[PDB]
Design a protein around this ligand. Structure first.
Ligand SMILES: Nc1ncnc2c1ncn2[C@@H]1O[C@H](COP(=O)(O)OP(=O)(O)NP(=O)(O)O)[C@@H](O)[C@H]1O
Ligand SMILES: Cc1cn([C@H]2C[C@H](F)[C@@H](COP(=O)(O)O)O2)c(=O)[nH]c1=O
Ligand SMILES: [Mg+2]
Ligand SMILES: [Mg+2]
Length: 209
């Protein structure tokens, strides 16, 4: 009985990391085997190159960095498939959708070109998108020093996310991330329990193919 692959995507400061941590904790407390992943995974050799880029400690050509972000997912595919096959549900803080939306926000990058490197990855059984109005986000801190942490760029990435949500091959669920941490958590947790039950029924799919 395989585990489910659950991805959290969402606007800046919408609560992806908070909700991913809370979801794994709740699932494990309810008797499931669940583990947390995040992308980029900065611990690998590729992940270190990505972390330096995001911190502005290095500059990387736009196409090359897009491909590093995708390679950083592929290097974890053997682990992802092993865990799901062993019955472990994986909760993932960002995935290929962020990969496409962030590079796709740059000039002269088509969504098609951006998707291709990730074609074939393990397909999420559930893609949560944490929606939040900017007035409500603003109250969640201030733009930091990392790359991409600016309004105009975030807005272009959001438009790309909306283009990806048109894709009916995926199980997208919108989450109102403007509520309390606990209320958002309960909405996510219930959606996740449902997905876990059904994932044991169909084989793990392949993304965008
Ligand atoms: N529902 C919520 N209400 C209020 N504050 C929240 C909520 N969820 C998260 N926060 C806070 O807002 C900040 C950002 O939350 P976090 O879950 O880290 O965002 P994130 O979605 O991972 N952001 P990023 O990774 O930068 O795109 C943290 O200090 C959280 O404690
Ligand atoms: C997974 C992924 C994330 N992002 C961006 C979005 C964001 F600025 C950053 C990750 O920030 P944290 O790792 O601190 O969550 O990297 C991309 O541009 N491409 C990707 O493939
Ligand atoms: Mg985060
Ligand atoms: Mg093609």
């Amino acid at each position: 009985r395989r585990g489910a692959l659950i991805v959290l995507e969402g606007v800046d400061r919408a609560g992806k990391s908070t909700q991913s941590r809370k979801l794994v904790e709740a699932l494990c407390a309810a008797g499931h085997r669940a583990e947390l992943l995040r992308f980029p995974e900065r611990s690998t050799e590729i992940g270190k190159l990505l972390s330096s880029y995001l911190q502005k400690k290095s500059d990387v050509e736009d196409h090359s960095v897009h491909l590093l972000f995708s390679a950083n997912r592929w290097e974890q595919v053997p682990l992802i498939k092993e865990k799901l096959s062993q019955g472990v549900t994986l909760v993932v803080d960002r995935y290929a959708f962020s990969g496409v939306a962030f590079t796709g926000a740059k000039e002269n990058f088509s969504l098609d070109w951006c998707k291709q490197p990730d074609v074939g990855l393990p397909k999420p059984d559930l893609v949560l998108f944490l929606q939040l109005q900017l007035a409500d986000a603003a109250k969640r801190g201030a733009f930091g020093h990392e790359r991409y942490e600016n309004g105009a760029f975030q807005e272009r990435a959001l438009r790309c996310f909306h283009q990806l949500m048109k894709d009916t091959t995926l199980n997208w669920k919108m989450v109102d991330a403007s509520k309390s941490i606990e209320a958002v958590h309960e909405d996510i947790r219930v959606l996740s329990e449902d997905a876990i039950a059904t994932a044991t029924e169909k084989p793990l799919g392949e993304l965008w193919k």
